[PDB]
Design a protein around this ligand. Sequence first.
Ligand SMILES: Nc1ncnc2c1ncn2[C@@H]1O[C@H](COP(=O)(O)OP(=O)(O)OP(=O)(O)O)[C@@H](O)[C@H]1O
Ligand SMILES: Nc1ncnc2c1ncn2[C@@H]1O[C@H](COP(=O)(O)OP(=O)(O)O)[C@@H](O)[C@H]1O
Ligand SMILES: [Mg+2]
Ligand SMILES: [Mg+2]
Lengths: 193, 578, 51, 468
Amino acid sequence: PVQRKLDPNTPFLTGMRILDVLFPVAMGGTAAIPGPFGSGKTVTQQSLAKWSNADVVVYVGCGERGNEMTDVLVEFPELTDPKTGGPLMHRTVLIANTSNMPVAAREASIYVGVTIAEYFRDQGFSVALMADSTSRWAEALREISSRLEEMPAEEGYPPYLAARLAAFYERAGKVITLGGEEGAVTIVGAVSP
Amino acid sequence: MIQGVIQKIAGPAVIAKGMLGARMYDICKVGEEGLVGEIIRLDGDTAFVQVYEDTSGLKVGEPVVSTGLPLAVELGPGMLNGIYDGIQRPLERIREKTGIYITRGVVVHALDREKKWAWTPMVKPGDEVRGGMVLGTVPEFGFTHKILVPPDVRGRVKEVKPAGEYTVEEPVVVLEDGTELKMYHTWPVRRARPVQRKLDPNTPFLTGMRILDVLFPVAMGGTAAIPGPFGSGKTVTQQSLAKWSNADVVVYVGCGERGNEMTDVLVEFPELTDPKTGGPLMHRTVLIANTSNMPVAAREASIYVGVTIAEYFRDQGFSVALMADSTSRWAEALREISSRLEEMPAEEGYPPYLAARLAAFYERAGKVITLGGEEGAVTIVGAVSPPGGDMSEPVTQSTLRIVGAFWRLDASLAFRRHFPAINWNGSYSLFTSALDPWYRENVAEDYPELRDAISELLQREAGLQEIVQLVGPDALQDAERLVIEVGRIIREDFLQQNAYHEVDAYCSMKKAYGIMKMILAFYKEAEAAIKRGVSIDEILQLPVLERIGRARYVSEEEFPAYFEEAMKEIQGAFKALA
Amino acid sequence: RRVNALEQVVIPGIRAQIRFIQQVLEQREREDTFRLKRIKGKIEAREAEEE
Amino acid sequence: LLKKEYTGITYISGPLLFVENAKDLAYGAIVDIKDGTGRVRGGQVIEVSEEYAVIQVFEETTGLDLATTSVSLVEDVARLGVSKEMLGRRFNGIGKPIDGLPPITPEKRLPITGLPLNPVARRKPEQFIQTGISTIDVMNTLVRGQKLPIFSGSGLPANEIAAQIARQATVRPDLSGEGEKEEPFAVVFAAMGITQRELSYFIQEFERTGALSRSVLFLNKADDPTIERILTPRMALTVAEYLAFEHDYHVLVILTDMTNYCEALREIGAAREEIPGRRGYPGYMYTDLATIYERAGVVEGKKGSVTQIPILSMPDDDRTHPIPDLTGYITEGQIQLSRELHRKGIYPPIDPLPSLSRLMNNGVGKGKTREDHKQVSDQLYSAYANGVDIRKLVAIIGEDALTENDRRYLQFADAFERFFINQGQQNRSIEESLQIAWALLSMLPQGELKRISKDHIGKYYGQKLEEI
Ligand SMILES: Nc1ncnc2c1ncn2[C@@H]1O[C@H](COP(=O)(O)OP(=O)(O)OP(=O)(O)O)[C@@H](O)[C@H]1O
Ligand SMILES: Nc1ncnc2c1ncn2[C@@H]1O[C@H](COP(=O)(O)OP(=O)(O)O)[C@@H](O)[C@H]1O
Ligand SMILES: [Mg+2]
Ligand SMILES: [Mg+2]
């Protein structure tokens, strides 16, 4: 719970010219970055994790490769936090669920990440949340609905697929917390058609 | 065997009760009329059978009797000079007892049970026998038919029937354990016959046609596919291969062809003659014939009976060629059978396991050492008819991944009346390099380089087809016109073979080698004579070009004399004209 | 120039669209066959095993 | 240990059979099925309940009946007996010898499904592999621990390229500054859907090279049962993981055709009546492929490594088909063969534009191979992406638009396609491949080479063409 939701009025500085200039996203907004394989989604999300002005960064590896998450564990302690001067990994929380790990756990990771991001929002920080791929979460929903022998929607997905995505993206926004301070959550989610 | 009664009739599906003990995929006899059926289900005391024939008129309570065996064929003497349907029923003997229609429920035997055969034993009591051995010989037309112990039988012999005339039903050899061996044995059509060892392809399959033997060869034991749009010339090419190849036994499979074309091939074949011996051609061939109105289960089993018969004639040591008419209709029958069983189609309407069946059919071809110690080979040639013209049709796509040779035909070359209509820019073969050691050690040492020169010259002429499309061929350069005329000569006097023509339908290897040698010599000498700079336009009308075309129709026995004549004419023309 | 442009640009562009539409329609038919199977199975169960 | 048999078969249809009183069968267990004739078949429990258990049969169900069929449990988890003596041997798709030699003596029995690696336990791939092909080694280099599939069409020499890579690939330790020392290199070769003409070619090439003494072959013919096609690559990966992470080997794994694996997967799923996917393939294909490709990599504190090079054939130039698409989302790059380069005679026909290596930046640079590798790769790539567009525009308009420097640049592009990409059956080292690239680089002025620094120009520029 919160008190109020406010209109975003400050930019979310990502450090990339085309995204910061042509297509800005505000502190508390949402964004989606679709594309085929080998396009540049993961590198963009990792650059946002390195160079953004958010205080706390939560990274959710829903159903992707393991080397892409090992790179984060190796490289990040050797870098520098842009706004505090310490190690970069001291502000970052990782939720990892690779592609060969159990399928039903993909649904839990998204909710765990968004719950942690909301928790750090209540303390007055500015949180940036990155989801590696929501299409894997959709595939997990498809498999679970297939086990229940439910009637499918287009392309076999369950008909309540859009409601879950609406309930996930709605958690972002700049709010006034119950304690009186001001926090914000911004969500950038990659889609894999 | 187990006997039961009917408790449900719904279309071609019949549910029987009391059938506890029946096995899957067995052949059952349904009703008082005796219709054949196949069991595909088991549930408690009941089993689901699927009737091949028409079920109209059946009543609940009629008996069902199981034969205890799956679909199988009878292998033995009497299969040559015969015509069979998809499940091995003799069409000639049915017509004798019934008429011009095929009444359902008729019972006939694949092998004539009342014909006497001469028997000559080759074993004595006290011997030990194992599956695949030879025990006895029987004369049959120009062949000698060998009696084989079935592959699944081993034992010790103490009984020999002496030399005399017996029917195939009479036992000839009785083993110590009570096993009686006859002149025939059964074998399921969907289980491949065992072999000792599978060999590599090292000997060519002599098709008798110049372009197929030289440019796109197939080895003994290989597989080839000949696709193309309708009206291309597949059937005549397959018949020419059946007539003139070096294979000992030919098997022809009709997978559901049109009635009039089946009548055409049924009438034409008895009039043909065997080129090896001069007798009728049907004395060495076995025909499997189906039309479009036959039961759909008989159409699916057509290609398995033929390949099982071909494997049987392989075990005796002969070389077998298996020609199969268009497998697209066989795939259509398979699709219909799958739709009868609700199999959730995957590709277009085809079942997901079409490629597995096609692979299982094509993998039986090969050169092997039989269980008796002899060597035999089986070659499979199949036809495809993609309706869309493009080779992206699912059956063609599945076939392209498991074949070694690919003889694509084109309809446009048929409109120009250039036959055979082989597209040399789309066809390919993967057997050239392996056949190269055989070629140079037997035909000639310079044969592969000469063949590569011919193919290179054909490739060069295809690169000039753009310039001909803008400007006329007369405005082209003298050397370019030279190579264009050489390509035209090569095409019209080397790649042409008319099949309806009486002496244009066959070509040996030595004739082709001599023609290629003459063509290369003429090309090289004319290329030098162009830079010689004398009569450069009159080079195209030299009298040597008559000798080049004359070698197409020269007899093989008269061929060396005309070869010397043409070579010395090339010498006397190019060396001493000017 | 016009011949080369038509040969190299327009025809494969139309052909790809034709292929895409064919695949979509075939996938829709494959989807509805599954629903027909499910409703046939539901018809069989309730009309033969209830009491 | 005592055995148990269940004879309560109640329903047989297609590939499935139902056993009534078998409550003590574990989920996913492996059973053997024996009928009245004594023939033994295989099966797996796919669904178990209180009323009955569902078992699918590995092969055809011909000859089975409800009167004499009995089902006996083999083991609860499908396991493979592995040993160090398997090097030099050949196995079928289920792990039995086919060479006629006596069967091995197992050391351990490992589950073939494996276990997921802990992301904390992995480490970053960093060591370069010299394959001998200039297009691969320079522009799309391969790193120990990578999974880099080869995208091929129908009628292209994928098998010959795979054999050449198997023959020529090794790591040179002296180039890395660590000093020269021998390292144990092994090859695990898995083949499925392979016809006899390809099987003989692979066996003959391996015997002629002499590489059979250090390789293990898993071969599955096209007329074999389709369950062995599913179970073939898992056993090869189980052997490779055991060797690499328990004997410090460096193992290179080649999967000959994944298109046949996907077709066999489609055949199995469609008989179990579940919802299909994009082109009839099952919807869980991504997870099933991920359980195969993700088993490679390196482990912290261990000297071993596993490298995968799958070969798959696209149905067309269709990059959007489900099989190469879902392969692209899991793997770390692709090497794509070009039909245009094959048509004009270039061998091997690797097209640099759709190709990509995602771990190139970690295995190149200062201290590894040579310090000019990345600069040379950038300079070699810098021409093609604009030269191809120039050639496309010329194919419509003509030669009128080209200037003189553009003519030089297109001549360099033609010489590039004729010399660098085309090498035939060569065995180039990385040093001589760099020398050939630099000899091509000396055909352009130093002022136009806008990528390489002038330190590298001052010590490598000016070499004339070497392969003539
Ligand atoms: N900003 C960039 N600068 C340089 N190279 C880049 C950049 N973005 C992407 N690349 C290159 O393209 C590759 C794309 O990798 P990336 O993980 O970003 O792709 P992706 O779209 O997430 O793919 P996938 O769906 O397969 O996970 C990188 O490995 C790198 O080689
Ligand atoms: N070698 C040949 N000589 C003469 N005519 C040929 C030859 N090959 C093909 N044709 C012609 O091609 C046509 C197609 O013949 P056929 O094989 O019966 O039909 P399809 O090609 O559709 O199976 C025939 O009319 C025949 O005249
Ligand atoms: Mg990614
Ligand atoms: Mg025809």
